[PDB]
């Protein structure tokens, strides 16, 4: 089927995977760091979504080098996904228009 | 649970003077502070909302001020009908809470 | 009329709907949770807009599982909308260019 | 000249205008509100940029109904602009590709 | 090779450069300002990424006119890059579709 | 309402010595702190803005320092013309406020 639709959805399974692994790696990297708050899975999951969507409320964030390395990956996955859908909706609107005109 | 403290518990003033009741929150609540009046055997009556906003029907001599943790409810020219218990209540964080109350006395 | 323009606007009615329902569901889910601040409609509405646009100032955010579930929906609606317009403005600029050249 | 390039730049003059008016209207609406921090022009300008780019650090934000109404406009202008450029860079990459292939 | 792919990657080297220079200029501009927190390179680097991705957690932000001027550049580089990739993924999905149909 | 406290209220110093006035805010205001000088029967005069920034025309012996809640206004080599009342004022949060003032005395 349509490429743009493959990667869009594919990026949605991937994002979810990174979102779950993120929560796990986050806790693992933050525990051991005095004052760290990203230390239990449940909220660590909420932190991931927050990050991936760049909403960043600031109620939770990493303080260790690895937690942050983990954050950069979640952010990038979030941003790459949300942008690979947009690029998909564009290839779709362009295709439909191209037919409502002649081609 | 936010703790609103109203001290003094009793207030003595002379007819016509300006009076002021204090309410202080155990933490910063912005302006989410509201005042109520309760006379003998009556139910509470909203006097001020959001620290300074006026209510329709309440005598122009009632005013409010404050932010964060320090709030003040004032009454220009204290009369008879003002004799009553005053309470403050916050909406900032759940659950809502009430002050210990302050009794006005002329 | 033009598809890309239908969904763009349609996503704008939808977003507004999610924005209002969001405010309502938010309060409903957060009240009952000690320390929660998303507890009155007015500000809860301001929280929605904040979320939908991913500006997240951090002055208000959910603390309950359902408030957060509600937040994820608002965020996603905000992001999907703001991206469905971009994909629309692209199908528009592509159409005009395609005529200022020959096709 | 090219439409997509007109609106992109045009949205850049507009954004700057909204950014300046934003700073002015912000102060005007926030002053008078106890505890408000968006009360001087200089920082109010930094707040605008922050908002327009949805970076929202949370060091400054509106607390009055009008300040927020002002914020929604800045956010939307920021988002519409930054998305009207992307849609422009797309019409550009699509045009160049369409020639490096045959059309 | 493909233009859209040149600028996308090129914007990725540029972004990294701005990200590193950002960290350096940030410290340089913030030190000397009482109460400033963007004062050591390591975290200043984490601040850059945060900014570039508009995730803004609010754990670190500039307080001097120059730090902020530096922030506006990082934000814009981040936003322009992340949008020049999207515009690239669009020119790619449009190209593949255009062949899975006839052209 | 931010509360700026200036203690001591009076300051005694010997000609030529270094003197320092304190101002402390009830909360963190960053550097939004500004100083004013007021001599007998005169109006206030801006001496320092944003805690440490200098003003054109003010003697180089006047300086300022601080952040958050603790601010200091200093004067290297206290003279005659320094006899006066000093006030601090904040712009961080609305409404602006003023310190209780400190009187310099040689
Ligand atoms: C891209 C992701 C960057 C994450 C930086 C995390 C710093 C905190 C840390 O990881 O460490 C936190 C730790 C205390 O918990 O302190 C420490 O070990 C402090 C040193 C930390 C890391 C060393 C790398 C510095 C790179 C600076 C580049 C400057 C260019 C100019
Ligand atoms: C996607 C949206 C995730 C929202 C998580 C909210 C957690 C707070 C809560 O809802 O609960 C708040 C509550 C206290 O108010 O505490 C509690 O009940 C704590 C437990 C909460 C939820 C259980 C789900 C945990 C999923 C972890 C996945 C780990 C993968 C590795
Ligand atoms: C879209 C922009 C929404 C801005 C809301 C600002 C609320 C604070 C305010 O402006 O007011 C702040 C003020 C205290 O300063 O308090 C007040 O007057 C509180 C009431 C404020 C506004 C009334 C509109 C409420 C709309 C709720 C819809 C619910 C749907 C379900
Ligand atoms: C676009 C980037 C804007 C950065 C503003 C930084 C203000 C803080 C500062 O740099 O200064 C911080 C400093 C204290 O550290 O205080 C000061 O010198 C305060 C004055 C600062 C800057 C003067 C420019 C004001 C522009 C207002 C436009 C209004 C239009 C209506
Ligand atoms: Ni064609």
JSON list of N, CA and C in Angstrom, two decimals, chain A residues 1-11 80-95, chain C residues 87, chain D residues 90 93-94 97-98 101, chain E residues 4-5 85-101:
[
{"chain": "A", "resi": 1, "resn": "UNK", "atom": "N", "xyz": [0.84, -1.23, 0.00]},
{"chain": "A", "resi": 1, "resn": "UNK", "atom": "CA", "xyz": [0.00, 0.00, 0.00]},
{"chain": "A", "resi": 1, "resn": "UNK", "atom": "C", "xyz": [0.86, 1.27, 0.00]},
{"chain": "A", "resi": 2, "resn": "UNK", "atom": "N", "xyz": [0.19, 2.42, 0.05]},
{"chain": "A", "resi": 2, "resn": "UNK", "atom": "CA", "xyz": [0.85, 3.73, 0.04]},
{"chain": "A", "resi": 2, "resn": "UNK", "atom": "C", "xyz": [1.99, 3.90, 1.04]},
{"chain": "A", "resi": 3, "resn": "UNK", "atom": "N", "xyz": [3.19, 4.21, 0.53]},
{"chain": "A", "resi": 3, "resn": "UNK", "atom": "CA", "xyz": [4.36, 4.41, 1.37]},
{"chain": "A", "resi": 3, "resn": "UNK", "atom": "C", "xyz": [4.10, 5.35, 2.54]},
{"chain": "A", "resi": 4, "resn": "UNK", "atom": "N", "xyz": [3.77, 6.60, 2.23]},
{"chain": "A", "resi": 4, "resn": "UNK", "atom": "CA", "xyz": [3.50, 7.60, 3.26]},
{"chain": "A", "resi": 4, "resn": "UNK", "atom": "C", "xyz": [2.58, 7.12, 4.37]},
{"chain": "A", "resi": 5, "resn": "UNK", "atom": "N", "xyz": [1.71, 6.16, 4.07]},
{"chain": "A", "resi": 5, "resn": "UNK", "atom": "CA", "xyz": [0.80, 5.64, 5.09]},
{"chain": "A", "resi": 5, "resn": "UNK", "atom": "C", "xyz": [1.46, 4.51, 5.88]},
{"chain": "A", "resi": 6, "resn": "UNK", "atom": "N", "xyz": [2.45, 3.86, 5.27]},
{"chain": "A", "resi": 6, "resn": "UNK", "atom": "CA", "xyz": [3.18, 2.78, 5.92]},
{"chain": "A", "resi": 6, "resn": "UNK", "atom": "C", "xyz": [4.03, 3.36, 7.04]},
{"chain": "A", "resi": 7, "resn": "UNK", "atom": "N", "xyz": [4.91, 4.29, 6.68]},
{"chain": "A", "resi": 7, "resn": "UNK", "atom": "CA", "xyz": [5.81, 4.94, 7.63]},
{"chain": "A", "resi": 7, "resn": "UNK", "atom": "C", "xyz": [5.07, 5.69, 8.73]},
{"chain": "A", "resi": 8, "resn": "UNK", "atom": "N", "xyz": [3.96, 6.34, 8.39]},
{"chain": "A", "resi": 8, "resn": "UNK", "atom": "CA", "xyz": [3.18, 7.08, 9.38]},
{"chain": "A", "resi": 8, "resn": "UNK", "atom": "C", "xyz": [2.75, 6.14, 10.49]},
{"chain": "A", "resi": 9, "resn": "UNK", "atom": "N", "xyz": [2.06, 5.07, 10.11]},
{"chain": "A", "resi": 9, "resn": "UNK", "atom": "CA", "xyz": [1.62, 4.10, 11.09]},
{"chain": "A", "resi": 9, "resn": "UNK", "atom": "C", "xyz": [2.81, 3.42, 11.74]},
{"chain": "A", "resi": 10, "resn": "UNK", "atom": "N", "xyz": [3.80, 3.05, 10.93]},
{"chain": "A", "resi": 10, "resn": "UNK", "atom": "CA", "xyz": [5.00, 2.38, 11.42]},
{"chain": "A", "resi": 10, "resn": "UNK", "atom": "C", "xyz": [5.68, 3.23, 12.49]},
{"chain": "A", "resi": 11, "resn": "UNK", "atom": "N", "xyz": [5.65, 4.54, 12.28]},
{"chain": "A", "resi": 11, "resn": "UNK", "atom": "CA", "xyz": [6.26, 5.48, 13.21]},
{"chain": "A", "resi": 11, "resn": "UNK", "atom": "C", "xyz": [5.40, 5.57, 14.47]},
{"chain": "A", "resi": 80, "resn": "UNK", "atom": "N", "xyz": [9.76, 13.37, 15.17]},
{"chain": "A", "resi": 80, "resn": "UNK", "atom": "CA", "xyz": [9.87, 12.73, 13.86]},
{"chain": "A", "resi": 80, "resn": "UNK", "atom": "C", "xyz": [8.55, 12.09, 13.46]},
{"chain": "A", "resi": 81, "resn": "UNK", "atom": "N", "xyz": [7.86, 11.48, 14.42]},
{"chain": "A", "resi": 81, "resn": "UNK", "atom": "CA", "xyz": [6.58, 10.84, 14.16]},
{"chain": "A", "resi": 81, "resn": "UNK", "atom": "C", "xyz": [5.53, 11.88, 13.75]},
{"chain": "A", "resi": 82, "resn": "UNK", "atom": "N", "xyz": [5.27, 12.81, 14.66]},
{"chain": "A", "resi": 82, "resn": "UNK", "atom": "CA", "xyz": [4.29, 13.87, 14.45]},
{"chain": "A", "resi": 82, "resn": "UNK", "atom": "C", "xyz": [4.56, 14.66, 13.18]},
{"chain": "A", "resi": 83, "resn": "UNK", "atom": "N", "xyz": [5.76, 14.52, 12.62]},
{"chain": "A", "resi": 83, "resn": "UNK", "atom": "CA", "xyz": [6.09, 15.24, 11.41]},
{"chain": "A", "resi": 83, "resn": "UNK", "atom": "C", "xyz": [5.99, 14.34, 10.20]},
{"chain": "A", "resi": 84, "resn": "UNK", "atom": "N", "xyz": [6.04, 13.03, 10.44]},
{"chain": "A", "resi": 84, "resn": "UNK", "atom": "CA", "xyz": [5.96, 12.04, 9.37]},
{"chain": "A", "resi": 84, "resn": "UNK", "atom": "C", "xyz": [4.50, 11.77, 9.02]},
{"chain": "A", "resi": 85, "resn": "UNK", "atom": "N", "xyz": [3.61, 12.22, 9.90]},
{"chain": "A", "resi": 85, "resn": "UNK", "atom": "CA", "xyz": [2.17, 12.07, 9.69]},
{"chain": "A", "resi": 85, "resn": "UNK", "atom": "C", "xyz": [1.77, 13.27, 8.85]},
{"chain": "A", "resi": 86, "resn": "UNK", "atom": "N", "xyz": [2.22, 14.46, 9.27]},
{"chain": "A", "resi": 86, "resn": "UNK", "atom": "CA", "xyz": [1.95, 15.70, 8.55]},
{"chain": "A", "resi": 86, "resn": "UNK", "atom": "C", "xyz": [2.39, 15.57, 7.10]},
{"chain": "A", "resi": 87, "resn": "UNK", "atom": "N", "xyz": [3.58, 15.00, 6.90]},
{"chain": "A", "resi": 87, "resn": "UNK", "atom": "CA", "xyz": [4.11, 14.82, 5.56]},
{"chain": "A", "resi": 87, "resn": "UNK", "atom": "C", "xyz": [3.27, 13.81, 4.81]},
{"chain": "A", "resi": 88, "resn": "UNK", "atom": "N", "xyz": [2.53, 13.00, 5.57]},
{"chain": "A", "resi": 88, "resn": "UNK", "atom": "CA", "xyz": [1.67, 11.97, 5.01]},
{"chain": "A", "resi": 88, "resn": "UNK", "atom": "C", "xyz": [0.33, 12.58, 4.59]},
{"chain": "A", "resi": 89, "resn": "UNK", "atom": "N", "xyz": [-0.22, 13.40, 5.47]},
{"chain": "A", "resi": 89, "resn": "UNK", "atom": "CA", "xyz": [-1.48, 14.07, 5.22]},
{"chain": "A", "resi": 89, "resn": "UNK", "atom": "C", "xyz": [-1.31, 15.03, 4.05]},
{"chain": "A", "resi": 90, "resn": "UNK", "atom": "N", "xyz": [-0.07, 15.39, 3.76]},
{"chain": "A", "resi": 90, "resn": "UNK", "atom": "CA", "xyz": [0.22, 16.30, 2.67]},
{"chain": "A", "resi": 90, "resn": "UNK", "atom": "C", "xyz": [0.22, 15.53, 1.36]},
{"chain": "A", "resi": 91, "resn": "UNK", "atom": "N", "xyz": [0.82, 14.34, 1.38]},
{"chain": "A", "resi": 91, "resn": "UNK", "atom": "CA", "xyz": [0.88, 13.52, 0.19]},
{"chain": "A", "resi": 91, "resn": "UNK", "atom": "C", "xyz": [-0.52, 13.04, -0.17]},
{"chain": "A", "resi": 92, "resn": "UNK", "atom": "N", "xyz": [-1.41, 13.09, 0.82]},
{"chain": "A", "resi": 92, "resn": "UNK", "atom": "CA", "xyz": [-2.78, 12.66, 0.63]},
{"chain": "A", "resi": 92, "resn": "UNK", "atom": "C", "xyz": [-3.63, 13.78, 0.05]},
{"chain": "A", "resi": 93, "resn": "UNK", "atom": "N", "xyz": [-3.51, 14.97, 0.62]},
{"chain": "A", "resi": 93, "resn": "UNK", "atom": "CA", "xyz": [-4.26, 16.12, 0.14]},
{"chain": "A", "resi": 93, "resn": "UNK", "atom": "C", "xyz": [-3.75, 16.50, -1.25]},
{"chain": "A", "resi": 94, "resn": "UNK", "atom": "N", "xyz": [-2.47, 16.27, -1.52]},
{"chain": "A", "resi": 94, "resn": "UNK", "atom": "CA", "xyz": [-1.90, 16.60, -2.83]},
{"chain": "A", "resi": 94, "resn": "UNK", "atom": "C", "xyz": [-2.42, 15.63, -3.88]},
{"chain": "A", "resi": 95, "resn": "UNK", "atom": "N", "xyz": [-2.59, 14.37, -3.49]},
{"chain": "A", "resi": 95, "resn": "UNK", "atom": "CA", "xyz": [-3.09, 13.37, -4.41]},
{"chain": "A", "resi": 95, "resn": "UNK", "atom": "C", "xyz": [-4.53, 13.62, -4.80]},
{"chain": "C", "resi": 87, "resn": "UNK", "atom": "N", "xyz": [-0.52, 20.69, 6.33]},
{"chain": "C", "resi": 87, "resn": "UNK", "atom": "CA", "xyz": [-0.60, 19.80, 5.19]},
{"chain": "C", "resi": 87, "resn": "UNK", "atom": "C", "xyz": [-1.57, 20.36, 4.17]},
{"chain": "D", "resi": 90, "resn": "UNK", "atom": "N", "xyz": [8.04, 23.03, 1.44]},
{"chain": "D", "resi": 90, "resn": "UNK", "atom": "CA", "xyz": [7.55, 21.80, 0.83]},
{"chain": "D", "resi": 90, "resn": "UNK", "atom": "C", "xyz": [7.24, 22.07, -0.63]},
{"chain": "D", "resi": 93, "resn": "UNK", "atom": "N", "xyz": [10.69, 22.19, -2.32]},
{"chain": "D", "resi": 93, "resn": "UNK", "atom": "CA", "xyz": [11.36, 20.92, -2.51]},
{"chain": "D", "resi": 93, "resn": "UNK", "atom": "C", "xyz": [10.58, 20.09, -3.54]},
{"chain": "D", "resi": 94, "resn": "UNK", "atom": "N", "xyz": [9.26, 20.27, -3.59]},
{"chain": "D", "resi": 94, "resn": "UNK", "atom": "CA", "xyz": [8.43, 19.52, -4.54]},
{"chain": "D", "resi": 94, "resn": "UNK", "atom": "C", "xyz": [8.67, 20.04, -5.95]},
{"chain": "D", "resi": 97, "resn": "UNK", "atom": "N", "xyz": [12.28, 18.84, -7.11]},
{"chain": "D", "resi": 97, "resn": "UNK", "atom": "CA", "xyz": [12.27, 17.42, -7.38]},
{"chain": "D", "resi": 97, "resn": "UNK", "atom": "C", "xyz": [11.58, 17.17, -8.71]},
{"chain": "D", "resi": 98, "resn": "UNK", "atom": "N", "xyz": [10.41, 17.79, -8.89]},
{"chain": "D", "resi": 98, "resn": "UNK", "atom": "CA", "xyz": [9.61, 17.62, -10.10]},
{"chain": "D", "resi": 98, "resn": "UNK", "atom": "C", "xyz": [10.35, 17.97, -11.38]},
{"chain": "D", "resi": 101, "resn": "UNK", "atom": "N", "xyz": [13.49, 15.12, -12.30]},
{"chain": "D", "resi": 101, "resn": "UNK", "atom": "CA", "xyz": [12.94, 13.83, -12.70]},
{"chain": "D", "resi": 101, "resn": "UNK", "atom": "C", "xyz": [12.34, 13.78, -14.10]},
{"chain": "E", "resi": 4, "resn": "UNK", "atom": "N", "xyz": [15.95, 18.57, -1.34]},
{"chain": "E", "resi": 4, "resn": "UNK", "atom": "CA", "xyz": [15.28, 18.40, -0.06]},
{"chain": "E", "resi": 4, "resn": "UNK", "atom": "C", "xyz": [16.05, 17.53, 0.93]},
{"chain": "E", "resi": 5, "resn": "UNK", "atom": "N", "xyz": [16.87, 16.61, 0.43]},
{"chain": "E", "resi": 5, "resn": "UNK", "atom": "CA", "xyz": [17.65, 15.76, 1.32]},
{"chain": "E", "resi": 5, "resn": "UNK", "atom": "C", "xyz": [18.97, 16.43, 1.71]},
{"chain": "E", "resi": 85, "resn": "UNK", "atom": "N", "xyz": [12.77, 19.07, 7.60]},
{"chain": "E", "resi": 85, "resn": "UNK", "atom": "CA", "xyz": [12.84, 17.62, 7.46]},
{"chain": "E", "resi": 85, "resn": "UNK", "atom": "C", "xyz": [11.44, 17.21, 7.03]},
{"chain": "E", "resi": 86, "resn": "UNK", "atom": "N", "xyz": [10.43, 17.72, 7.74]},
{"chain": "E", "resi": 86, "resn": "UNK", "atom": "CA", "xyz": [9.03, 17.44, 7.43]},
{"chain": "E", "resi": 86, "resn": "UNK", "atom": "C", "xyz": [8.74, 17.79, 5.97]},
{"chain": "E", "resi": 87, "resn": "UNK", "atom": "N", "xyz": [9.24, 18.94, 5.53]},
{"chain": "E", "resi": 87, "resn": "UNK", "atom": "CA", "xyz": [9.04, 19.38, 4.17]},
{"chain": "E", "resi": 87, "resn": "UNK", "atom": "C", "xyz": [9.78, 18.46, 3.22]},
{"chain": "E", "resi": 88, "resn": "UNK", "atom": "N", "xyz": [10.76, 17.74, 3.77]},
{"chain": "E", "resi": 88, "resn": "UNK", "atom": "CA", "xyz": [11.58, 16.82, 2.99]},
{"chain": "E", "resi": 88, "resn": "UNK", "atom": "C", "xyz": [10.86, 15.48, 2.86]},
{"chain": "E", "resi": 89, "resn": "UNK", "atom": "N", "xyz": [10.32, 15.01, 3.98]},
{"chain": "E", "resi": 89, "resn": "UNK", "atom": "CA", "xyz": [9.59, 13.76, 4.01]},
{"chain": "E", "resi": 89, "resn": "UNK", "atom": "C", "xyz": [8.34, 13.88, 3.16]},
{"chain": "E", "resi": 90, "resn": "UNK", "atom": "N", "xyz": [7.92, 15.12, 2.90]},
{"chain": "E", "resi": 90, "resn": "UNK", "atom": "CA", "xyz": [6.74, 15.37, 2.10]},
{"chain": "E", "resi": 90, "resn": "UNK", "atom": "C", "xyz": [7.11, 15.26, 0.63]},
{"chain": "E", "resi": 91, "resn": "UNK", "atom": "N", "xyz": [8.25, 15.82, 0.27]},
{"chain": "E", "resi": 91, "resn": "UNK", "atom": "CA", "xyz": [8.70, 15.77, -1.12]},
{"chain": "E", "resi": 91, "resn": "UNK", "atom": "C", "xyz": [9.04, 14.35, -1.50]},
{"chain": "E", "resi": 92, "resn": "UNK", "atom": "N", "xyz": [9.26, 13.52, -0.48]},
{"chain": "E", "resi": 92, "resn": "UNK", "atom": "CA", "xyz": [9.60, 12.13, -0.69]},
{"chain": "E", "resi": 92, "resn": "UNK", "atom": "C", "xyz": [8.36, 11.28, -0.86]},
{"chain": "E", "resi": 93, "resn": "UNK", "atom": "N", "xyz": [7.38, 11.48, 0.02]},
{"chain": "E", "resi": 93, "resn": "UNK", "atom": "CA", "xyz": [6.13, 10.73, -0.06]},
{"chain": "E", "resi": 93, "resn": "UNK", "atom": "C", "xyz": [5.37, 11.16, -1.32]},
{"chain": "E", "resi": 94, "resn": "UNK", "atom": "N", "xyz": [5.54, 12.42, -1.73]},
{"chain": "E", "resi": 94, "resn": "UNK", "atom": "CA", "xyz": [4.85, 12.91, -2.92]},
{"chain": "E", "resi": 94, "resn": "UNK", "atom": "C", "xyz": [5.47, 12.30, -4.17]},
{"chain": "E", "resi": 95, "resn": "UNK", "atom": "N", "xyz": [6.78, 12.11, -4.14]},
{"chain": "E", "resi": 95, "resn": "UNK", "atom": "CA", "xyz": [7.47, 11.52, -5.28]},
{"chain": "E", "resi": 95, "resn": "UNK", "atom": "C", "xyz": [7.10, 10.07, -5.48]},
{"chain": "E", "resi": 96, "resn": "UNK", "atom": "N", "xyz": [7.09, 9.30, -4.39]},
{"chain": "E", "resi": 96, "resn": "UNK", "atom": "CA", "xyz": [6.75, 7.88, -4.45]},
{"chain": "E", "resi": 96, "resn": "UNK", "atom": "C", "xyz": [5.30, 7.67, -4.86]},
{"chain": "E", "resi": 97, "resn": "UNK", "atom": "N", "xyz": [4.40, 8.48, -4.32]},
{"chain": "E", "resi": 97, "resn": "UNK", "atom": "CA", "xyz": [3.00, 8.36, -4.66]},
{"chain": "E", "resi": 97, "resn": "UNK", "atom": "C", "xyz": [2.83, 8.63, -6.15]},
{"chain": "E", "resi": 98, "resn": "UNK", "atom": "N", "xyz": [3.44, 9.72, -6.62]},
{"chain": "E", "resi": 98, "resn": "UNK", "atom": "CA", "xyz": [3.36, 10.14, -8.02]},
{"chain": "E", "resi": 98, "resn": "UNK", "atom": "C", "xyz": [3.80, 9.07, -9.01]},
{"chain": "E", "resi": 99, "resn": "UNK", "atom": "N", "xyz": [4.44, 8.01, -8.51]},
{"chain": "E", "resi": 99, "resn": "UNK", "atom": "CA", "xyz": [4.90, 6.93, -9.37]},
{"chain": "E", "resi": 99, "resn": "UNK", "atom": "C", "xyz": [4.04, 5.67, -9.20]},
{"chain": "E", "resi": 100, "resn": "UNK", "atom": "N", "xyz": [3.41, 5.54, -8.04]},
{"chain": "E", "resi": 100, "resn": "UNK", "atom": "CA", "xyz": [2.54, 4.41, -7.74]},
{"chain": "E", "resi": 100, "resn": "UNK", "atom": "C", "xyz": [1.15, 4.68, -8.32]},
{"chain": "E", "resi": 101, "resn": "UNK", "atom": "N", "xyz": [1.06, 5.71, -9.16]},
{"chain": "E", "resi": 101, "resn": "UNK", "atom": "CA", "xyz": [-0.20, 6.08, -9.79]},
{"chain": "E", "resi": 101, "resn": "UNK", "atom": "C", "xyz": [-0.17, 6.26, -11.30]}
]
